[PDB]
């Protein structure tokens, strides 16, 4: 066993993870970052307690029990804060810790490396461990948690795997935090999974042999892998076996789901041409154009190189633009205007291919929601399949 760690924000996407957990029949981990979530609302409008209910009514609309959800927090620590100086930016990783932890958060991952101006990008090692010991006990005070620590053609130097566990686990006992180190069951490490606009790089077992095998000096913990999205089911068995054990999927699970959205979109635009004033990608061109903050450092080149990316990249940033009122307005209107509408099989292997083998067996309804939760599925059935 491995376990998949869901962090979309995606109300659909929550759905159908759960959905899924439930036939397997085991827990569901969902996640969020510092930056989605926190006190002051993050770029979302939700405290930790907004997200735990939000995931809550999910839950309920579905008959899908509390008790088998799991809430992770990524990234935890100064980052949303980091352009302050740096006693005030760990004020507030303070404050932050302690909603999640009085919100329920169970895996607090506590990523304390990076620099608050001024100091140098990447902090040197005690002072990364000596604020993640700090937040650990500040964690314990107000309050069951696990713990991640660490943070990322790179790959993991193995030597540095276990320092890191080193000096976390002296600077944990110099805070009398020691009790919360025995609860860290995981590091963050780079076992060789990148993925850019338009390729992917795929897990080279060979290449982390020396790192993988570090994990015999660390008992009682394993690692937590990032963007392993758009990963092979091969790829994905061989990282739990190796002992990444703890997968970080997002992109891959927004990105299913525009493809489908998309499909959908098209499908309504040939049977009901009429009945839209305009199309969800024309909606959703036009709203990340005007507002290009959260792709903007991602897309580069030509203005038509801009486009394709906008929709089609892997980097998926069009998942940002999902909450904007414009946007979700015309997803709306595209699900609202296919409700009850018994898609044809024809359409279906044309426009959402990758559900067609699935619709003529049955197993998934031809009507545009179980079309969508159908595209999410797919890229979760290999995380499950590899736990």
């Known amino acids: 066993r491995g376990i998949p760690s869901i962090c979309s924000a995606h109300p659909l996407v929550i759905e159908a993870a759960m959905l899924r957990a439930h036939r397997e029949k085991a827990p569901v981990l969902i ?28 839950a309920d609309r579905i008959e899908f029990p509390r008790e088998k959800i799991l809430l992770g927090g990524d990234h935890l620590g100064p980052n949303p804060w980091k352009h302050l100086p740096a006693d005030e930016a760990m004020a507030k990783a303070e404050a932050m810790i302690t909603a999640y932890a009085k919100a329920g958060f169970t895996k607090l991952h506590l990523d304390t490396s990076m ?43 193995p030597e540095a795997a276990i320092e890191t566990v080193r000096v976390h686990r002296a600077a944990f006992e110099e805070a009398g935090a020691a009790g919360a ?43 937590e892998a990032h963007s392993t999205d758009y990963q092979t089911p091969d790829a994905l068995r061989e990282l739990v076996a190796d002992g990444f054990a703890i997968l970080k999927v997002g992109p891959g699970l927004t990105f299913a789901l525009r493809e489908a959205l998309y499909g959908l979109d098209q499908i309504a635009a040939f049977l009901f041409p009429a009945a839209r004033e ?74 959402l291919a990758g559900s067609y083998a699935r619709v003529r067996n049955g197993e998934v309804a ?13 890229v979760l059935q290999d995380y499950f399949a590899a736990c």
């Open 31 to 58: 996640e969020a970052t510092c930056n989605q979530v926190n006190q002051d609302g993050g770029y979302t409008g939700m405290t930790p307690e907004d997200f735990t209910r939000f995931v809550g009514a999910i």
């Open 115 to 157: 620099g608050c101006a001024g100091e140098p990008t990447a902090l040197p090692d005690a002072t990364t461990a000596a604020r993640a010991a700090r937040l650990a006990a500040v964690a314990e005070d107000a309050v069951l948690p696990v713990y991640i620590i660490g943070t990322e053609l790179e790959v993991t130097a």
């Open 181 to 223: 180190f025995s609860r860290v069951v995981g590091a963050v490490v780079q076992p060789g999974v990148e993925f850019g606009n338009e390729n992917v790089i795929a897990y080279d077992r060979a290449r982390a042999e020396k790192l993988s095998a570090t994990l015999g000096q660390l008992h009682g913990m394993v690692f």
């Open 278 to 351: 305009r199309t969800l990608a024309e909606v959703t061109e036009a709203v990340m154009r005007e507002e290009p903050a959260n792709w903007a450092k991602y897309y580069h080149g030509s203005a038509e190189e801009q486009r394709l990316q906008r929709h089609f990249s892997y980097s998926d940033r069009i998942r940002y633009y999902w909450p904007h009122p414009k946007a979700a307005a015309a997803v709306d209107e595209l699900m609202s205007l296919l409700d009850g509408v018994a898609i044809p099989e024809t359409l279906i292997s044309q426009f």
């Open 366 to 378: 031809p009507q545009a929601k179980p079309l969508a939760l159908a595209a999410v599925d797919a």
